[PDB]
UniProtKB/Swiss-Prot annotation:
Lineage of the organism: Eukaryota, Metazoa, Chordata, Craniata, Vertebrata
Catalytic residues in the record: H318, H363
Entry's disease: Familial cold autoinflammatory syndrome 3: An autosomal dominant immune disorder characterized by the development of cutaneous urticaria, erythema, and pruritis in response to cold exposure. Affected individuals have variable additional immunologic defects, including antibody deficiency, decreased numbers of B-cells, defective B-cells, increased susceptibility to infection, and increased risk of autoimmune disorders.
Gene name per UniProt: PLCG2
PROSITE patterns, sorted: C2 (PS50004), PH_DOMAIN (PS50003), PIPLC_X_DOMAIN (PS50007), PIPLC_Y_DOMAIN (PS50008), SH2 (PS50001), SH3 (PS50002)
Occurrences of domain SH3 (ranges): 734-794
Name this polypeptide is given: 1-phosphatidylinositol 4,5-bisphosphate phosphodiesterase gamma-2
Length: 1206
């Protein structure tokens, strides 16, 4: 359409239409006003203008599907609707996209909507960062106040600041900023809010400009930048690009002008030479077009797509239909759509027997929602080539019968048709044809009819109800029987969820009004809570008026009280305040008071202050005012199960330490009642302790464990009887806290410790502030920063636990193992505890409580009972030729699975992770030679029931191109996979370099052969928009690391910034960090931002996986993605990247830098000679001190030497 036509479409969008919306949660579709607020960039659905039901970020839109093709559109009401007037918006950062399904009334409305959203999404990637900052500010403002207010208040600001993850330094600070902006009745406008933002971000991180304020490349001439008013010019910016960012296109001034006028995006800047300010320069420093990502790898390169397929890493996925853990995930073809849109070229299809004659796709012999094959194949055809249009190989795991195989083949030949690859592209094939030769071709890998011939197992697993005695319910656990060992996992159900007196004990009013002065002190102490003191009412029990309530209310500058009068009318109570304002129902009292305007000539203002009990904990079970540490410990010995928590008051203290069971440990954490807010940690501000419990029963207090069971006294009793679950738990000492050295830290002061990478430091005491007293050779008990090292404890118990994870039926996630050999089953046909279907496992010894397991069906009860009863007592299938012929390439061959010699390009190697890793350990070069012609499926083993992925990198070096990784997970390795397959324009077909395709290359070269080709020097300087995980404000720290090979993998975290994530600043005094990667192509740069809680445990905030080949030099912004590799709004780091070539002279010097490690590993070996050993001879150890500083200098010198050099 034309630009004015597009404008009319988008204004129709902004106007909004009352349109039908479908949901699987709410069966009835509802008519809601759907409209786009362009300034917030939100598609919002509302019931009225002020009440908006839901938001949808336009940049969050990933896919628009016309018609009824969504799980919301399977409803019967959708059948009455028409497809031309139906569509869905797919949005969200999660793997399964949230689906906003809109059914239309007229086809014109629908087509206008699709066109408008496509235009808005197109301009979404075209929006400059200042515009998205405007949008995000407007989002905060329209989120805190639903009426879409364009003004902001003092308090309100006191609440946005924690929400946008910034800690209010002081009320005086925000007041001062209000003043310099200009505050009228301490209220600001949206533009003044934006100015407030500019001030905060510039002032908080104005020391970034110091790097440009330096005196080597004064070309940029950054100076006088102290104030944001300071500004630069187009010439300054192009000198910055040509020198710091090292941009060759920057030679032309006109391109620089175009980029600058794009970034500023302000019509008022009509200057022939565009100019921006120092604060605006800093905003650019965290902007999208300053991304460290290389854009020339965002475009598909045809010369890199014309080569035999064996030389192409191809993005593959394991059990792709699954959306969560393999045990109970909900299979959906939308997962296939998602993976194809990311750019997968291989999706696993576990085709099992179908009751209808059509195979169902799910994880067989497990409890997962089955899906129809035809819907799957339709979805694959629809969205396989909508992105990147390169061939996808369907991973078919055949587990059906021959009739279903005929249906399989005919479905492929019908739905896919020409899309399916049926005949070889060229008959006399010597090798794999290029992906360019395979334009939009469906390749089927599937067990061919090798035996030919003319014409021609599960373990007992499932959910069970374990009879809990703590709560006297039936808690459902997933159980798997492996070698007569039934293992049960955690709760599956856990993820699923009068006219009097009641008002007296309601949130509105609770207790303690024995005198009207008590209410006056209750609400006067509550008067200085907010800015407007008019918002102050309370109901109370009268002291003088008998059997009457009394509204103690504020009145425009003072606190008053008046009795809520009560009468007996019609045999019922009747409370009245005004002559005709009255009711009888208290639950309805709250609502009609909320709608009430406290109207009377006397009373014109309404306030609606739901102020509750100043201390409900006062009357709280988990609250224990007189309970001390010792009492808690003892009583937690009585209840040693994780999730048992009590809030015991410290005697004579406002802090109420929480005694709770964390990993079988009695952990305490004080909650200080600062002012009125109960603060956990440093900034976890809570209204009250009951709110604390309610928030942390669904939020993680400490690692995985959550506040699960409050430990009541009575409880002590119910568990007076114990051993309900037996606490299988995990079924040397820690004075040293043995640590590894992240990087070469130099002794800043004589009490600081000098050492080298990988150094084993012992007798380490964790003094706060990051400085740890540790022993290192002759340097006994010396400081070293916590960021320059890493902790690796001797969790031998945890290792045994991981061995259990290995041989465990459930593998990981198992919450308990019970050996069925040493038990007996008794089946209860009448059942036990209100459950007819019960089988009780009574152990050999009656001393072990018999445990009751319940099912939902009598037949499954019989099956479980039969299996465990048996434990106690102790070519022909003719795979379809019609499907086999469809397998042009990659036909499985189990006969020569171990054979890697004489490879055939038409063959495929299916390997599990452990088998492939073993092959790599034995012979990397042989498998590389095979995959030079052949191909490899490396896929996770059956123990990865939790969708956790393995390390896929060693496989890629050996040429193992096809690595099925579970796309539903959020682990490190899938961020690695997304980083790898984002290369070459996110096509999923990555050409390996020339070295890979030659046999002379060693996939794992010897340490002597390893030579530097890239010694990166990275420097983190600042950040913007670090996301918040929990109530407590994130205390972020960045860890930059090369997760390349076992020689490239190197980590470095930085000093933690406390209570600042909106505009966190790292010290410029930190040293430049050197990553010596011997191979540039096979390496990845990863900035993982974490946050530190009160337990100082890092928690994943975000990641920054980028290929080294894509890494550009300069002061580059680094966009931050979530665990699903999706860019979150405005979250970005800044890094002073420096690309570095290994010159011949540098190489000699880098041979010296290898001499560094060649003898510092022996320096570490002499630290280990006296690691904790003491009965030693001081001959070499003390004489490697020579060695010691010789190496210290040797390197630091020649490194800062090349430093000084470039």
């Amino acid at each position: 359409l034309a630009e004015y036509e597009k404008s009319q479409i988008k204004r129709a969008l902004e106007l909004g239409t009352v349109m039908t919306v479908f949901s699987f949660r709410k069966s009835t579709p509802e008519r809601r006003t759907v409209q786009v607020i362009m300034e917030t960039r939100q598609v919002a659905w509302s019931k009225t203008a002020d009440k908006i039901e839901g938001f949808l970020d336009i940049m969050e839109i990933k896919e628009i599907r016309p018609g009824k093709n969504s799980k919301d559109f399977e409803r019967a009401k959708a059948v009455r609707q028409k497809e031309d007037c139906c569509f869905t918006i797919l949005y969200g950062t999660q793997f399964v996209l949230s689906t906003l399904s809109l059914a239309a009334d007229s086809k014109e409305d629908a087509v206008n909507w699709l066109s408008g959203l496509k235009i808005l999404h197109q301009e979404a990637m075209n929006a400059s960062t200042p515009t998205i900052i405007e949008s995000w500010l407007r989002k905060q403002i329209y989120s805190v106040d639903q009426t879409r207010r364009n003004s902001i208040s003092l308090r309100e600001l006191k609440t946005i600041l924690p929400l946008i993850n910034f800690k209010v330094s002081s009320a005086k600070f925000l007041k001062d900023k209000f003043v310099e902006i200009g505050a009228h009745k301490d209220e600001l406008s949206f533009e003044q809010f934006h100015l407030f933002y500019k001030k905060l971000m510039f002032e908080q991180q104005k020391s970034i400009l110091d790097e440009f304020k330096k005196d080597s490349s004064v070309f940029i001439l950054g100076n006088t930048d102290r104030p944001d008013a300071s500004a630069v010019y187009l010439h300054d910016f192009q000198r910055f690009l040509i020198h710091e960012q090292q941009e060759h296109w920057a030679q032309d001034l006109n391109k620089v002008r175009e980029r600058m006028t794009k970034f500023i995006d302000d019509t008022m800047r009509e200057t022939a030479e565009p100019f921006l300010f120092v604060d605006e320069f800093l905003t650019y420093l965290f902007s999208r077009e300053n991304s460290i990502w290389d854009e020339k790898y965002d475009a598909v390169d045809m010369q890199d797509m014309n080569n035999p397929l064996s030389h192409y890493w191809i993005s593959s996925s394991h059990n792709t239909y699954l959306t969560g853990d393999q045990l109970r995930s909900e299979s959906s073809p939308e997962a296939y759509i998602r993976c194809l849109r990311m750019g997968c070229r291989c999706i696993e299809l576990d085709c099992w027997d179908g009751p209808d004659g059509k195979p169902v796709i799910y994880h067989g012999w497990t409890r997962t929602t089955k899906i129809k094959f035809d819907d799957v194949v339709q979805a694959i055809k629809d969205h396989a080539f909508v992105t990147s249009s390169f061939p996808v190989i369907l991973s078919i795991e055949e587990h059906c019968s021959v009739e279903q195989q005929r249906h399989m083949a005919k479905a492929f030949k019908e739905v896919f048709g020409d899309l399916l690859l049926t005949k070889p592209t060229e008959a006399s094939a010597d090798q794999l044809p290029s992906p360019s030769q395979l334009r939009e071709k469906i390749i089927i890998k599937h067990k061919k009819l090798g035996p030919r011939g003319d014409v021609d197992e599960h373990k007992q697993q499932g959910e069970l109800y374990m009879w809990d005695s703590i709560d006297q319910k039936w808690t459902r656990h997933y159980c798997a029987i492996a070698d007569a060992k039934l293992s049960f996992s955690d709760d599956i159900e856990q993820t699923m969820e009068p006219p009097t007196e009641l008002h007296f004990g309601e949130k509105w009013f609770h207790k303690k009004v024995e005198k009207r002065t008590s209410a006056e002190k209750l609400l006067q102490e509550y008067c200085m809570e907010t800015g407007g003191k008019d918002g102050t009412f309370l109901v109370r029990e009268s002291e003088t008026f008998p059997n009457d309530y009394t509204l103690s209310f504020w009145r425009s500058g003072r606190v008053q009280h008046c009795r809520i009068r009560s009468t007996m009318e019609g045999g019922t109570l009747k409370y009245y305040l005004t002559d005709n304002l009255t009711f009888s129902s208290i639950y309805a009292l709250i609502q009609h008071y909320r709608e009430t305007h406290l109207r009377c000539a006397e009373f014109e203002l309404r306030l609606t202050d739901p102020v509750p009990n100043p201390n409900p904990h006062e009357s709280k079970p988990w609250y224990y005012d007189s309970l001390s540490r010792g009492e808690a410990e003892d009583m937690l010995m009585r209840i040693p199960r994780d999730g048992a928590f009590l809030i015991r008051k410290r005697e004579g203290s406002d802090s109420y330490a929480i005694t709770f069971r964390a990993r079988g440990k009695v952990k305490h954490c004080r909650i200080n009642r600062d002012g009125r807010h109960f603060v956990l940690g440093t900034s976890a501000y809570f209204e009250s302790l009951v709110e604390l419990v309610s928030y942390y029963e669904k939020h993680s207090l400490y690692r995985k464990m959550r506040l699960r069971y409050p430990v009541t006294p009575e409880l002590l009793e119910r568990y007076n009887m114990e051993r309900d679950i037996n606490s299988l738990y995990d079924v040397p000492s820690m004075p040293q806290r043995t640590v590894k050295a992240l990087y070469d830290y130099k002794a800043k002061r004589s009490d600081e410790l000098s050492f080298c990478r990988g150094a084993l430091i012992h007798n380490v005491s964790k003094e706060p502030g990051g400085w740890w007293k540790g022993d290192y050779g002759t340097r006994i008990q010396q400081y070293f920063p916590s960021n320059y090292v890493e902790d690796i404890s001797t969790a031998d118990f945890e290792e045994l636990e991981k061995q259990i994870i290995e041989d465990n039926p459930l593998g990981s996630l198992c919450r308990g193992i019970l050996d069925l050999n040493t038990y007996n089953v008794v089946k209860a046909p009448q059942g036990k505890n209100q459950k007819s279907f019960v089988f009780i496992l009574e152990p050999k010894q009656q001393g072990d409580p018999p445990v009751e397991f319940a099912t939902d069906r009598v037949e499954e009860l019989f099956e479980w009972f039969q299996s465990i009863r048996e434990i106690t007592w102790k070519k022909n299938q003719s795979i379809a030729i019609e499907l086999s012929d469809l397998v042009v390439y990659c036909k499985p061959t189990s006969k020569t699975k171990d054979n890697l010699e004489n490879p055939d390009f038409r063959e495929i190697r299916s390997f599990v992770e452990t088998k492939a890793d073993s092959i790599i350990r034995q012979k990397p070069v042989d498998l590389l030679k095979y995959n030079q012609k052949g191909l490899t499926r490396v896929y996770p083993k059956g123990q990865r029931v939790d969708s956790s992925n393995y390390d896929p990198f060693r496989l890629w070096l050996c040429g193992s191109q096809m690595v099925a990784l579970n796309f539903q997970t959020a682990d490190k390795y899938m961020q690695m996979n997304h980083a790898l397959f984002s290369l070459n324009g996110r096509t999923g077909y990555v050409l390996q370099p020339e070295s890979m395709r030659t046999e002379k290359y060693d996939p794992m070269p010897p340490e002597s052969q390893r030579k530097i080709l890239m010694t990166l020097t990275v420097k983190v300087l600042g950040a913007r928009h670090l996301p918040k995980l929990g109530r407590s404000i994130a205390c972020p720290f960045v860890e930059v690391e090369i997760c390349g090979a076992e020689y490239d993998n190197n980590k470095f975290k930085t000093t933690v910034v406390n209570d600042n994530g909106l505009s966190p600043i790292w010290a410029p005094t930190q040293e430049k960090v050197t990553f010596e990667i011997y191979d540039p192509n096979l390496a990845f740069l990863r900035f993982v931002v974490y946050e530190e809680d009160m337990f100082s445990d890092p928690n994943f905030l975000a990641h920054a996986t980028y290929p080294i080949k894509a890494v550009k030099s300069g002061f580059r912004s680094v966009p931050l993605k979530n665990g699903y590799s999706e860019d979150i709004e405005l979250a970005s780091l800044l890094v002073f990247c420096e690309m570095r070539p290994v010159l011949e002279s540098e190489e000699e010097l880098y041979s010296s830098c290898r001499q560094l490690r060649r003898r510092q590993e022996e320096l570490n070996n002499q630290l280990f000679l006296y690691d904790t050993h003491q009965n030693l001879r001081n001959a070499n150890r003390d004489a490697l001190v020579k060695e010691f500083s010789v190496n210290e200098n040797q390197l630091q010198l020649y490194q800062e030497k090349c430093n000084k050099r470039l």
